[PDB]
């Protein structure tokens, strides 16, 4: 795991511990969130598998219990550009690299581990995804911006 990466989880654990009241335990419902701050992108399915809960209040974890959890999430399977384009290829009806704003927002909020409409509203804002006069977006740009993350 590297000492440095253990220090790095130390600094995130501490940050989250303060925000649910500083007592050396972070809520097991923020388990996935601490791991994403560390640069990994597991599925909710992955973090439930290492003990993550479905609700605040349910269970709380001290540092040395976050440690093996983060250790096992780090080998969760992450999607590639290649896969992303192929998936979004399946919604492209005209073959020119577009997908309408509504079909995008529909695939994200409806399929897989559906995001909330609020989650979709936000990501669209941050990536600055704009529709053209016909209401389409280039999904290859969106895909590149999401993967590049907020700082960039």
């Amino acid at each position: 795991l590297s000492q440095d990466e253990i220090d790095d989880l130390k600094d995130v654990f501490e940050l989250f511990d303060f925000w649910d009241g500083r007592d050396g335990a972070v809520d097991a419902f923020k388990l996935g969130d601490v791991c994403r701050c560390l640069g990994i992108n597991p599925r909710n399915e992955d973090v439930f598998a290492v003990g993550g809960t479905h609700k605040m209040g349910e269970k709380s974890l001290p540092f040395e219990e976050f440690l093996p959890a983060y250790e096992g999430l780090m080998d969760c399977e992450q999607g590639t550009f290649a896969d992303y384009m192929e998936a979004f290829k399946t919604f492209d009806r005209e073959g020119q690299g577009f997908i309408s704003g509504a079909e995008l927002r529909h695939v994200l909020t409806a399929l897989g581990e559906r995001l909330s409409d609020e989650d979709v509203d936000e990501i669209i804002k941050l990536t600055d995804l704009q529709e053209d006069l016909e209401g389409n977006v280039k999904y290859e740009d969106f895909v590149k911006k999401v993967m590049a993350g907020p700082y960039p």
Partner: protein, 64 residues
């Protein structure tokens, strides 16, 4: 080719939850500083408010 399309969408959705948390990170950190400043300084005030010297100075503050 569905289960796979669905697994691939979930991993893209996973990228997105990542982006959103890591975006949110820097604001949590800044705000931790803010809430600490507020919490520790209100408490200095509470301590000062029950210090007898303060209590005394505070009643002679008007008469001056």
């Amino acid at each position: 080719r569905d289960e796979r399309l669905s697994k691939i969408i979930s991993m893209f959705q996973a990228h997105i939850r990542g982006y959103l948390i890591r975006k949110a990170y820097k604001k949590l950190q800044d705000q931790r500083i803010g809430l600490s400043v507020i919490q520790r300084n209100i408490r200095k005030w509470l301590v000062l408010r029950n210090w007898q010297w303060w209590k005394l100075y505070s009643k002679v503050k008007p008469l001056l």
